[PDB]
Automatic annotation (TrEMBL), chain G:
The keyword Transmembrane helix applies. It is a multi-pass membrane protein. The gene is Ndufa11. Belongs to the complex I NDUFA11 subunit family. It comes from the Eukaryota. GO terms for biological process: mitochondrial electron transport, NADH to ubiquinone. GO terms for cellular component: mitochondrial inner membrane; respiratory chain complex I. Complex I is composed of 45 different subunits. Disulfide bonds join C17-C74, C94-C114. It comes from Mus musculus (Mouse). This is NADH dehydrogenase [ubiquinone] 1 alpha subcomplex subunit 11. Pfam families: Tim17. The keyword Mitochondrion applies. Keywords: Membrane, Mitochondrion, Mitochondrion inner membrane, Transmembrane, Transmembrane helix.
Length: 344, 120, 98, 171, 115, 80, 140, 171, 48, 105
């Protein structure tokens, strides 16, 4: 792609969510979501293979329906109240349809079936944007209407996302699907608390982004897309295993790493409202979320796998790819728990 | 929840009321912890790019330390302001609604009969 | 008015049922999406004409604009699908599971 | 002529239903065209000319491209009309009958409040300005050029960037 | 109802005319006259098969330009506003943006057909 | 570049006319003095009733009647 | 109607055994219909007949689960007269797991389901008794 | 809950103009100068007080002044005015421009008799500062009292008591 | 008409407020014929 | 909103046509202007939970102006009773409702 086109497309991607935040009309909100939709497909379909075409078609066709459902909710609110904002004294059916469509946009279970597929069908970048930046405006909708959501399906969807992400990532040898099921689980943790202090939803979002972006960079540095490809990392670039390990163990939330803070404080604010057994189930399936990360980091950092003869050429040559932000984002994850009161 | 607080300025990192709070020390354990995080960031950057460690990028390491401290100072100031505001509003609400937070008056261990539970 | 709003909402629901319940082709799905757009347009327009809210009348044109852009990129994806497989069917798109 | 709008709405429902049954895109486009026509007619019935004319124009220009495409891509030897499938014909008949039964049902459990077969045509226009000028639809849309100029720029960007998106997807 | 009446009149003219065209003449039907033309010989395949269109990009951009028409068309009412500068600038911007898109397509050979 | 435009006026004169007319449309509103009377005429048109005003007793410049001296004399629209 | 399922608690266990029994049977049937719609949409059958058979097997199985559960609970509450006792719900959950491992030929499924469902039903009674409001409204 | 009050039939029984629209468009420019005081009082009441039921008598004075106006036109300058409006009513949009010579006859008549000068181009399109013995309407819209906002916490804010009460962090 | 039904105020409102709420084409022209009802609507929309 | 960039800069990109009583292009009132204005002027300073029950009368009047359900019920009842009486032969419609009045102007 020529530079004019990249400028246009990345401006559109940046402006979709930005319009979605700085807009009181729900319709310009919808407009921003549709810019995010339209501008993503060119770069999803850039390499021009059947996998990319399938990924782009699935993304488009799943997001268009959710967009139409959100527009229905908005038009029904306009009919009811003559305004372009979800007030109180709106209909719970309108609000729940909005929630359903937003969950289909995010990728939450039982609307999760498309995210791992699409993510496998596209490069490591366009998985990063898809899993980090596209999640921010759809979450902004819910954050702006958090005292209007029903506290029941909001939690059933979270619990389904937790369970299904854990169980799906249990058996995925492909890494681009592990990241997807991780997204599903973390959006579950977010959406569970979103009616309860939505600052914590943004906390978990920022933590999740700061963990996933450098992980995607790690996969990018050798174009690793499989357990067997990431296992050939004690030979190619072995200075990264420390950060990969601590980042995986932050993703699967273990205490001394800051990836335990969101789950811990979420459980806190959920036990402050007598949402006890749900939090218990969530905390007990986060362990299964941790299990496959542990398997992975065995495979790459603790039990060095066989390598090849041709991997010595990689040792002859030199590299330039670590963007100097991998370091900052990996170290600000995994080592920022004692600064947690300044995060909350 | 404090977004709808009256007089709340939109996208104001440090309102003028926060200038009445005392600042940090600049020797705070958390700012030197952030400097340590910057030093480890530079070290990790050098380790990843197959460079020497504690020897190579002293300008980069200094910049990392200073950026981390120079951001943490203001972020910690904002957080101090926000927690101050929390205590402020909490005190105001209890002072406006004493019927809900009554002047409780507790008893002694001579008047209350807590039950005995032997071990045996 | 309440009658026709009920009917238009049922029409939206029918087109949504359609685009959800797939058949072989994809063009039909895109057409169902266009039908949902059209029903939403008419709902917005009728509410605006009833309430005499001429300030919101720029909303349905925006709906048509973005829905047509949506249709455009869908049809481009369809061009790619045909260039790959040849026959528009949505059952041939079954290789990301593996 | 009091049941006019109800007949138009029912016809639109049937058009979108036959659409949702998904015959070949030729007859689907026919359904889109008929339903856009009906939509225009009711938007006029509620006092709006411009919006209906523009739905009609846009959907016609769109189904032209759909014909051009479906002759190339979504074509079969036997394009599967509504009558082609006994099952589709049955669900179409059943859908008409089901919506009729549903209307006759909700005209009973609620005397009025959702549908009024009894008073029909009595609640359409809701406080017209009996004396007026410079009041039609078109002033509100022309406000895209004044007092709502963000809709205009955001739409124009959608179209502009869509051109680049088209070229890149197709390349 | 005047317009409805004119259109019904034209409709019924056309249908009465077709009725006459079909039920007035004589018929001698047989399979060799009711099968498709293809210039004396028989077709080698069906006509309900793919016809590759080589101007599809032109079709899609025609759709977007149709929307541009829909946006430009309120101008006769937009001109009787008091501002007459915001509308000027905004219409200028819209038309210039459309021309820029046309120029990009032209230079990138989107108006050329897929040989 | 004068030679380039000389070449383009022969080969492809349709785009030359187009760019010329575009720039002319953008530049000529800045030039004319009649450009400002457009908003004034669009304002002068009374599509809606001029609602009268209560006599506070402190409205000198406001007229007491239609054909009084005060108010905006629309004679600039006459003999424009 | 929510009142139908709320009739399960109009009277304690040991009383109205048939009522609670086929209430729980209906509940199991509903859950089985959900599971069947999901197993028929995803991983569909080779034929509509086998799809119908899948639905019937799943629904009748979950119905039997609920029926044995309600029978066992109200019986073991009538016998050993103790409504406020989650061991009755434990025994009912174990009977359900046994029927699961009987309808589905597996002893390991029987034991696994016994333990899990029994503990689940015990916790259900404990929460209904002590007031655990899952899906609670926000209070702070 | 509250009954609507309405005037009786005889609180609306009025001597009407019974006069058509071209006859009236012709004399518009003279009815805007003469009979302006009553009309503007009626307008001020009708917009200041948002109730028709509070201004019937001003409407009756409007009708009375119009009747007096056309009585003057009948007893003086009836034939030229007849010709004017008769030629005006021929058109489909009732355009003054097509009848520009009968204006002259009517205006010269109504000027030489009663000295009624035609308003110039933009004199009837501006505000005109009426007075009246009436008072201001206190609280139109029948608005209820506004609920009082929640009070602001007055204080010079201090450091948080023992810092963050988080779990075990000291500072 | 409704002299006989048990609880019915004849001039009752549908609003808690007391100010003038202008009527609409169905309250007005409600008890009237169908021609007036079908000329209120569809009268200007269907040109003369 | 989420990021109040408009309030930061004082602009109004979209927050001036948020509802009916908001700057129609030429000064033509939308229906329920008064009701919505009154509801909004009650629910100012307050936020949400308190306005939903201290400004309920005004919202209910607005809801009846816009959706207009109770007047439908009232006219439907009047019509039903009239049809019953006319079927029984008790009511006798007048000239000014059968189509024969003296038009007022
Ligand atoms: C804990 C996570 C352990 C994960 C296990 C990783 C692993 O398997 O080790 C690689 C091992 C492969 O052995 P190898 O081939 O000799 O390793 C090549 C080195 O990369 C060769 O590296 P080099 O030749 O470029 O130079 C040596 C390199 C050697 O340094 C390293 O590569 C790793 C040092 C990390 C030490 C972490 C210990 C825990 C500290 C607690 C705090 O740099 C140093 O000298 C270390 C400087 C001081 C430490 C800097 C680390 C700052 C980040 C701190 C993060 C703390 C997280 C806890 O397997
Ligand atoms: C010591 C070490 C400190 C820690 C080192 C960093 C550790 C790295 C991990 C951090 C991950 C967790 C961060 C979570 C967090 O930042 O709080 C969530 C925080 C919770 O939001 P909230 O307080 O509930 O309501 C915010 C309102 O929506 C919006 O209303 P607002 O009044 O709060 O305005 C937003 C405010 C936000 O400014 C901030 O303080 C957020 C900066 C966080 C950076 C992350 C480090 O101002 C700005 O956005 C800056 C604009 C300045 C204009 C030019 C001067 O999220 C945000 O505020 C998003 C703001 C995005 C602004 C861009
Ligand atoms: C180094 C040389 C560079 C110059 C240093 C400047 C020397 C100086 O005069 O100022 C030092 C500065 C001020 O000294 P000071 O003003 O005279 O005395 C004030 C008190 O120390 C007041 O200090 P504090 O006790 O109140 O500490 C403040 C802050 C503490 O903030 C911190 O600085 C955290 C320190 C790390 C612990 O929060 C706390 O209160 C303690 C909470 C600690 C939370 C730990 C939770 C996580 C468990 C550990 C996880 C493992 C690490 C991460 C994962 C590693 C694997 C990847 O204090 C320090 O930096 C000493 C740090 C003490 C470490 C605590 C060990 C536990
Ligand atoms: C159509 C708009 C959507 C409305 C819903 C559909 C209702 C009509 C469907 C009737 C079934 C038609 C069908 O099955 O295909 C048969 C035909 C195809 O015909 P055929 O190819 O099978 O040939 C039949 C041969 N003979 C006559 C000997 C039996 O397709 C159509 O009918 C679609 C045409 C439009 C139908 C609407 C007619 C409206 C009348 C206006 C005159
Ligand atoms: C939920 C209940 C599901 C019941 C399944 C009924 C079977 C069916 O027709 O739905 C699937 C159908 C897809 O059609 P297809 O895959 O081609 O099936 C073979 C037909 N020859 O799906 C469709 O074609 C879309 C049908 C939409 C229904 C619209 C009519 C609703 C009123 C009845
Ligand atoms: C309100 C009323 C709520 C009632 C709750 C009912 C509980 C339903 C339990 C979830 C259904 C799971 C059914 C199932 O077993 O999955 C089968 C399906 C694969 O099919 P198959 O392997 O052939 O069947 C094996 C039989 N165990 O496996 C799958 O395809 C996975 C489907 C999982 C989706 C479950 C989501 C349910 C919760 C949605 C909340 C909204």
């Amino acid at each position: 792609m020529n530079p004019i086109t990249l400028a246009i497309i990345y401006f559109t991607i940046f402006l979709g969510p930005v319009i979605t935040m700085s807009s009181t009309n729900l319709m310009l909100m919808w407009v921003g979501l549709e810019f995010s939709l339209l501008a993503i497909i060119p770069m999803l379909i850039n390499k021009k293979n059947p996998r990319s075409t399938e990924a782009a078609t699935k993304y488009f066709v799943t997001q268009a329906t959710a967009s139409m459902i959100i527009l229905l909710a908005i038009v029904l609110n306009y009919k009811q109240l003559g305004t372009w904002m979800f007030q109180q004294q709106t209909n719970g059916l309108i609000l729940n349809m909005t929630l359903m469509a937003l969950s289909m946009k995010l990728g939450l279970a039982p609307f999760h079936f498309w995210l791992p597929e699409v993510t496998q069908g596209i490069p490591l970048h366009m998985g990063l944007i898809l899993l980090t930046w596209q999640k921010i405006a759809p979450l902004s909708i819910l954050i702006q209407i958090y005292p209007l959501l029903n506290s029941t399906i909001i939690l059933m969807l979270a619990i389904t996302s937790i369970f299904m992400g854990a169980w799906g990532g249990l058996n995925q040898t492909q890494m681009r699907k592990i990241m997807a099921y991780s997204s599903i689980a973390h959006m579950g943790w977010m959406l569970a608390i979103l009616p309860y202090n939505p600052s914590l939803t943004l906390l978990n979002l920022m933590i999740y982004i700061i963990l996933t972006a450098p992980m995607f960079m790690a996969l990018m540095l050798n174009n690793s897309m499989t357990i067997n490809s990431i296992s050939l990392l004690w030979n190619k670039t072995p200075a990264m295993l420390t950060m990969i390990s601590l980042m995986l163990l932050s993703l699967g939330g273990l205490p001394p790493l800051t990836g335990f803070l969101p789950k811990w404080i979420i459980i806190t604010e959920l036990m402050k409202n007598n949402c006890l057994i749900m939090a218990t189930l969530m905390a007990m399936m986060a362990l299964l979320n941790l299990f496959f990360y542990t398997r992975l980091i065995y495979s790459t950092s603790l039990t060095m796998f066989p390598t090849n003869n041709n991997s010595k050429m990689m040792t002859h040559q030199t590299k330039t790819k670590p963007n100097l932000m991998f370091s900052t984002l990996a170290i600000m994850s995994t080592m920022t728990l004692p600064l947690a009161p300044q995060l909350i | 929840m404090m977004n709808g607080r009256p007089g709340h300025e939109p996208l104001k990192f440090l309102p003028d009321e926060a200038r009445s709070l005392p600042p940090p020390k600049l020797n705070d354990p958390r700012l030197v912890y952030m400097g340590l995080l910057g030093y480890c960031t530079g070290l990790m950057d050098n380790m990843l790019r197959m460079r020497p460690v504690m020897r190579a990028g002293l300008h980069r390491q200094l910049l990392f330390v200073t950026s981390f401290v120079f951001a943490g100072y203001f972020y910690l100031k904002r957080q101090n302001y926000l927690y101050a505001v929390k205590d402020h509003d909490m005190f105001g609400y209890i002072k406006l609604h004493p019927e809900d937070f009554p002047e409780k008056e507790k008893k002694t261990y001579a008047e209350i009969l807590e039950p005995f539970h032997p071990v045996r | 008015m309440p009658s026709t709003f009920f009917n238009l909402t049922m029409a939206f629901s029918l087109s949504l049922l359609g685009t959800l319940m797939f058949r072989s082709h994809l063009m039909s799905t895109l057409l169902c999406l266009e039908g949902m757009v059209l029903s939403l347009f008419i709902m917005t327009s009728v509410t605006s004409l009833n309430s005499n809210s001429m300030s919101s009348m720029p909303i349905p044109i925006t709906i048509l604009v973005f829905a047509a852009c949506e249709a455009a990129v869908g049809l481009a994806l369809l061009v790619k699908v045909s260039n790959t497989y040849g026959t528009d069917y949505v059952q041939n798109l079954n290789l990301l599971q593996c | 002529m009091n049941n006019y709008i109800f007949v138009l709405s029912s016809l639109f429902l049937v058009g979108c239903l036959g659409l949702a049954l998904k015959p070949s895109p030729i007859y689907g486009g026919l359904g889109l065209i008929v339903s856009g026509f009906v939509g225009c007619l009711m938007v006029l019935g509620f006092g709006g000319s411009f919006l209906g004319l523009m739905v009609f124009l846009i959907y016609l220009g769109g189904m032209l491209v759909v014909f051009g495409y479906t002759t190339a891509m979504a074509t079969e030897e036997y394009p599967e009309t509504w009558g082609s499938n006994w099952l589709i014909l049955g669900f179409l008949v059943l859908g008409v009958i089901m919506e009729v039964f549903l209307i006759c049902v909700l005209n009973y459990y609620d005397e009025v409040g959702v549908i009024n077969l009894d008073g029909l045509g009595d609640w359409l226009m809701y406080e017209v300005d009996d004396v007026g000028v410079m009041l039609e639809g078109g002033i509100g849309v022309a406000a895209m050029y004044s007092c709502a100029t963000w809709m205009m720029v955001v739409a124009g960007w959608s179209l502009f960037a869509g051109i680049f998106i088209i070229i890149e997807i197709t390349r | 109802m005047n317009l409805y009446t004119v259109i019904f009149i034209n409709i019924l003219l056309s249908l009465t005319l077709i009725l006459v065209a079909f039920w007035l003449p004589q018929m001698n039907l047989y399979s060799e006259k009711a099968n498709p033309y293809e210039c004396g010989f028989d077709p080698t395949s069906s006509a309900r098969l793919p016809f590759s269109m080589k101007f599809f990009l032109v079709a899609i951009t025609f759709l977007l330009f149709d929307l541009e028409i829909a946006l430009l068309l309120p101008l006769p009412w937009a001109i009787q506003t008091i501002k007459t500068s915001t509308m000027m600038i905004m219409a200028f911007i819209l038309v210039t943006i459309l021309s820029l898109g046309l120029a990009y397509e032209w230079t990138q050979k989107g108006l050329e057909w897929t040989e | 570049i004068s030679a380039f435009l000389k070449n383009a006026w022969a080969k492809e004169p349709v785009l030359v006319v187009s760019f010329s007319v575009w720039g002319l449309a953008i530049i000529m509103p800045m030039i004319s003095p009649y450009t400002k009377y457009a908003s004034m005429i669009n304002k002068a048109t009374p599509y809606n009733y001029p609602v009268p005003v209560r006599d506070d007793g402190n409205m000198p410049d406001v007229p007491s009647h239609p054909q009084d001296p005060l108010g905006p004399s629309l004679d600039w629209l006459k003999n424009l | 109607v929510k009142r139908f399922f709320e009739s399960y608690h109009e009277v304690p266990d040991g009383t109205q055994c048939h009522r609670k029994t086929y209430i729980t049977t209906a509940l199991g049937g509903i859950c089985g219909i959900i599971g069947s719609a999901y197993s028929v949409s995803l991983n569909p059958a080779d034929s509509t007949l086998e799809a119908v058979a899948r639905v019937g097997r799943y629904t009748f199985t979950a119905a039997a689960i609920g029926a044995m559960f309600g029978l066992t609970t109200c019986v073991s509450a009538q016998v050993r007269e103790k409504p406020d006792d989650p061991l009755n719900y434990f025994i009912g959950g174990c009977a359900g797991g046994l029927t699961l491992g009987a309808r589905t030929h597996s002893y390991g499924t029987a034991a696994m389901g016994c333990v899990y469902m029994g503990t689940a039903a015990a916790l259900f009674k404990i929460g209904k008794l002590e007031g655990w409001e899952l899906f609670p409204t926000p209070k702070v | 809950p509250g009954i609507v009050e309405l005037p009786t039939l005889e609180e609306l029984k009025v001597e009407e103009v019974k006069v058509s629209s071209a006859v009236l468009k012709a004399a518009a420019h003279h009815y805007g100068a003469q009979c302006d005081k009553t009309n503007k009082e009626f307008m001020l009441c009708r917009w200041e007080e948002k109730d028709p039921r509070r201004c019937l008598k001003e409407g009756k004075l409007v009708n009375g002044c119009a009747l007096n106006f056309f009585r003057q036109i009948k007893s003086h300058c009836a034939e030229p005015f007849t010709e004017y409006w008769t030629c005006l009513d021929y058109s489909n949009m009732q355009l003054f421009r097509h009848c520009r010579q009968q204006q002259a006859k009517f205006d010269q008549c109504v000027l030489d008799k009663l000295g009624w000068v035609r308003p110039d181009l933009g004199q009837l399109s501006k505000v005109t500062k009426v007075k009246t013995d009436r008072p201001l309407p206190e609280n139109p819209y029948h608005s209820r009292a506004r609920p009082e906002p929640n009070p602001v916490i007055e204080g010079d804010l201090k450091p948080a008591k023992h810092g963050t009460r988080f779990f075990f962090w000291t500072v | 008409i409704m002299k006989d039904v048990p609880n019915w105020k004849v001039g009752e409102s549908v609003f808690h407020t007391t100010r003038w709420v202008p009527p609409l084409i169905g309250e007005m022209y409600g008890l009237r014929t169908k021609e007036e009802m079908s000329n209120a609507n569809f009268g200007f929309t269907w040109y003369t | 909103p989420f990021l109040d960039i408009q309030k930061k800069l004082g602009i109004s990109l979209d927050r001036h046509f948020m509802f009916l009583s908001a700057e129609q292009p030429y000064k033509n009132a939308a229906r329920c202007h008064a009701f919505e204005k009154e509801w909004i002027e009650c629910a100012h300073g307050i936020g949400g939970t308190r306005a939903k029950k201290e400004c309920k009368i005004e919202f209910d009047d607005f809801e009846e102006c816009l959706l207009r359900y109770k007047t439908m019920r009232r006219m439907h009842d009047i019509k039903k009773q009239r049809e019953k009486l006319m079927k029984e032969g008790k009511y006798t419609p007048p000239p000014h409702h059968s189509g024969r009045e003296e038009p007022r102007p």
